[PDB]
Amino acid sequence: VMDVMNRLILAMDLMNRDDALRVTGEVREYIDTVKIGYPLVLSEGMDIIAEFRKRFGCRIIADFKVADIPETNEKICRATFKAGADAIIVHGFPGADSVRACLNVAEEMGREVFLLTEMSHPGAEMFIQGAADEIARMGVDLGVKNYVGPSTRPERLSRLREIIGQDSFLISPGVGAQGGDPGETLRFADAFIVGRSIYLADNPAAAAAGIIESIKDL
Amino acid sequence: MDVMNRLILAMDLMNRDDALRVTGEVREYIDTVKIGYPLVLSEGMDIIAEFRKRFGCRIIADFKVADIPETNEKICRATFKAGADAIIVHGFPGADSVRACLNVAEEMGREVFLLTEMSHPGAEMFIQGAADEIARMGVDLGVKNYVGPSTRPERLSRLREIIGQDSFLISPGVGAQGGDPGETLRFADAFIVGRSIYLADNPAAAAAGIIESIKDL
Ligand SMILES: O=C1CC(=O)N([C@@H]2O[C@H](COP(=O)(O)O)[C@@H](O)[C@H]2O)C(=O)N1
Ligand SMILES: O=C1CC(=O)N([C@@H]2O[C@H](COP(=O)(O)O)[C@@H](O)[C@H]2O)C(=O)N1
Known part of the structure; x- marks a missing residue:
């Protein structure tokens, strides 16, 4: 599994190239794994992945929450890996064939797929939560090794860890701005994701x- | 929305030259193009303005938006800044995530299309069981544009029943996925076609x- 420095992944959702680069560079000594999503990619282009690799010695996770039919998912993954992404995040709710499409491209291109099970926001309770345990089980059956679960719902994150087992890799967003606690999140997740609490801070x-200091013992 | 010939081209080619050449070859038949991530992640968001300059066509950004509210807002802003007329959003993530998109669309004078049930086989696992409720949620939220599956006419009909005749409904899955143009138009206002057109010899x-097959429609 990837070695995430300090078990902390930066969710770089600033939409300005200059600001995204500045902030990422300022926390470079604490984080070697950056999650880049559509807010930044749709604002600056896929070349931003390359720019981040060139400027920082950071691993890149393309948080594209892939959620299309198998055929389109395949193209999205191919374009994303061609750009230099180490891994991509894929939604599990669209079903097994859509996930398998991503796993196939990741396999052939030598990259990784992260399967998003339950989400951290309030709305996730309407439809996703009820399907989450099965989506996770599906991922296990499909051979998925990397997963994403909510830090905002410790009980749910715990169950997801049980389903995927101790060997699987689990990352969790929702720490900070959304109310998730770093320490509690690490009881189940291998690493947690933090965006606004870091990139909107004066320093x-x-x-x-x-x-990181709050979880030094971990 | 007035879609010429009730046909929306899904331009999923991943090469700028081919995408522009093919779209130009069928421009006389359409005035609405669906641009998704295959083309956008391969050529950049500037491709949207390029299409508007070249064809003046209407552009629907098929981004299957499916994040938390905060991120959804940013995604919609970046998308409409690029010139997209509408954006497609997943309903599965919940009401708050959809509302986030609706707010940005209203602010920038654009439309939100709510994807309820998908056309591929995997849609049967989790999406289909929540589809009717997702559509009802759209109604409660005031959504007026929807996306349903041409591959399952009975499901497409149910979606039309829920949203009513005034709502706008588009449907993918025609051609390559097995959907029939005429049957789909029994319930949808317009259908989406990708491969059957952009992969055809001509x-x-x-x-x-x-279009000939639906001349009477
Ligand atoms: O369930 C999930 C999945 C996810 O990726 N995210 C993403 O994780 C990040 C959280 O950022 P923040 O720390 O709340 O500012 C954003 O990039 C979100 O889009 C989330 O918040 N919830
Ligand atoms: O349920 C759905 C939603 C959707 O947008 N699509 C999209 O519609 C297009 C279908 O193209 P095609 O005619 O099968 O080649 C693609 O761009 C898909 O990503 C789909 O096929 N099924």
Whole structure:
């Protein structure tokens, strides 16, 4: 499994190239794994992945929550890996064939797929939560090794860890701005994701260092 | 929305030259193009403005938006800044995530299309069972544009029943996925066609034929 420095992944959702680059560079000494999503990619282009690799010694997770039919999912994954992404996040609710399409491209291109089970926001309770345990089980049956679960619902994150087992890799967003606690989240997740708490701080480096200090024993 | 020939081209080619050449070859048959991530992630968001300058066509950004509210807002802003007229959003993530999109669309004068049930086999696992409720949620939220599966006419009909005759409904899955143009138009206002056209030896003739089959519609 990837070695996430300090078990902390930066969710770089700033939409300005200059700001995204500045903030990421300022916390570079604390994080070697950055999650880049559509807010930044749709604002600056896929070349931003390359720019981040060139400037920082960071691993890149393309958070594209892939959720299309198998055929289109295949194209999305191919374009994303061609750009330099180490892994891609895929939604599990669209079904097994859509996930398998991503796993196939990741396999052939030598990259990784992260399967998003339950989400961290309030709305996730309407439809996703009820299908989450099965989506996770599906992922296990499909051979998925990397997963994403909600830090905002410790009981749910715990169950997801049980389903995927100790060997699977689990990352969890929702820490900070959404109310998730770093320490509690690490009881089940291999690493947690943090965006606004760091990138909106007057001193991102101090914010990141502070979060890490809170979990030094872990 | 007035879709010419009730046909929406799904331009999923991943090469700028081919995408522009093929779209140009069938421009006389359409005025609405669906651009998704295959083309956008391969050529950049500037491709949207390029299409508007070249064809003046209407552009629906098929981004299957499916994140938390905060991120959904950013995605919609970046998308409409690029010139997209509408954006497609998943309903599965919940009401708050959809509302986030609706707010941005209203602010920038655009439309939100709610994807309820998908056309592929995997849609039967989790999506189909929640589809009717997702559609009802759209109604409660005031959504007026929807996306349903041409591959399951009975499901497409049910979606039309829920949203009513005033709502706008488009449907993918025609051609390559097995959907029939005429049958789909029994319930949808317009259907979406990708491969059957952009992978055809002669895209223009492919489009011409499809339109010929629904001439009476
Ligand atoms: O369930 C989920 C999945 C996810 O990826 N995310 C993403 O994780 C990040 C959370 O950022 P933040 O720390 O709340 O600012 C954003 O990029 C979200 O789009 C989330 O918040 N919830
Ligand atoms: O349920 C759905 C939703 C959707 O948008 N689509 C999209 O519609 C297009 C269908 O193209 P095609 O005619 O099968 O080649 C693709 O761009 C898909 O990503 C789909 O096929 N099924």
